[PDB]
């Protein structure tokens, strides 16, 4: 009955993945290893993508669940090209609080920089208003 509200706000300091242009970045969110897998839109040709997209993900156990965030470059022939990732424990957010923070993405092998991503995260009972403190 707890919901993870995650606003994938923006990222910065992304790598130039190819000689032809800037990154076409999008983010994938996954709860644990479950089927709850969400994707943002692709922002074409920028190192500072701004998505400002909200996702509402039902949670299984707020003491152990993990959110994986995986930043990738849109498929241009070789599948989506991984940039970087982070695994965020759900238990580090006080229940009911709206937490707006930057996170350091770990670049995958062969990638020169991982980027930094801003997420606003709010875990609340599913009937509460998302992205407002649950007093
Ligand atoms: Cl182009
Ligand atoms: Cl939205």
Q: Which of 46, 51, 50 is nearest to 23 (CA)?
A: 46
Q: Which ligand is nearest to the CA of 52?
A: 2
Residue whose token pair is 């400002």:
52
Cα torsion angle, 104, 48, 58, 85, sign: negative
Distance CA 78, CA 22 (A): 17
Question: What's the gap in Å between 6 CA and the centre of ligand 2?
Answer: 10
Q: Is residue 79 part of a domain?
A: yes
Q: Is residue 78 part of a domain?
A: yes
82 in Cβ contact with 97 (< 8 Å) = no
Q: Is residue 133 part of a domain?
A: no
Number of domains in the chain: 1
Question: What's the gap in Å between 112 CA and the centre of ligand 2?
Answer: 31
Q: Is residue 135 part of a domain?
A: no
Question: What's the gap in Å between 57 CA and the centre of ligand 2?
Answer: 12
E strands along the chain, which residues?
2-12, 25-31, 37-39, 50-58, 66-73, 81-89, 98-104, 106-107, 116-125
Q: Which helix (H) or strand (E) holds 41?
A: none
Question: What's the gap in Å between 45 CA and the centre of ligand 1?
Answer: 7
Q: Which of 66, 64, 49 is nearest to 15 (CA)?
A: 49
Partnered with residue 95 across adjacent β-strands are none
Q: Is residue 132 part of a domain?
A: no
102 in Cβ contact with 121 (< 8 Å) = no
Distance CA 2, CA 123 (A): 7
CATH number of the domain encompassing residue 10: 2.60.40.150
Residue whose token pair is 């991982």:
114
27 in Cβ contact with 11 (< 8 Å) = yes
Resolution (A): 1.3
66 in Cβ contact with 89 (< 8 Å) = yes
Residue 63 belongs to domain spanning? 2-125
Question: What's the gap in Å between 32 CA and the centre of ligand 2?
Answer: 22
Listed in sequence order, the residues at least 6 apart from 133 whose beta carbon sits closer than 8 Å to its beta carbon are 96, 97, 98
Cα torsion angle, 11, 17, 19, 24, sign: negative
Q: Is residue 118 part of a domain?
A: yes
Q: What is the dihedral of CA 76, 34, 97, 8, to 10 degrees?
A: 10
Q: Which ligand is nearest to the CA of 51?
A: 2
Question: What's the gap in Å between 103 CA and the centre of ligand 2?
Answer: 20
Question: What's the gap in Å between 51 CA and the centre of ligand 2?
Answer: 9
Q: Is residue 76 part of a domain?
A: yes
Partnered with residue 37 across adjacent β-strands are 30
125 in Cβ contact with 133 (< 8 Å) = no
Rg (C-alpha) for the chain, rounded Å, is 15
**CA count, 13 A, side-chain hemisphere, 14:** 31
**CA count, 13 A, side-chain hemisphere, 58:** 5
Question: What's the gap in Å between 76 CA and the centre of ligand 1?
Answer: 11
């Amino acid at each position: 009955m707890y919901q993870l509200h995650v606003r994938v706000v923006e990222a910065k300091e992304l790598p130039k993945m190819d000689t032809f242009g800037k990154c076409d970045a999008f983010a994938i969110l996954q709860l644990n290893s479950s089927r709850n897998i969400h994707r943002t839109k692709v922002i074409e040709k920028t190192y500072t993508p701004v998505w400002n997209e909200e996702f509402h993900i039902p949670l299984e156990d707020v003491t152990i669940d993990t959110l994986t965030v995986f930043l990738k470059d849109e498929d241009k022939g070789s599948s989506d090209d991984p940039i970087s990732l982070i695994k965020i424990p759900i238990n580090q957010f006080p229940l009911g609080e709206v937490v707006d923070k930057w996170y350091s993405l770990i670049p995958v092998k062969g990638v020169k920089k991982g980027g930094q991503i801003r997420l606003t995260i709010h875990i609340a009972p599913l009937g509460a208003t998302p992205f407002q403190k649950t007093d």
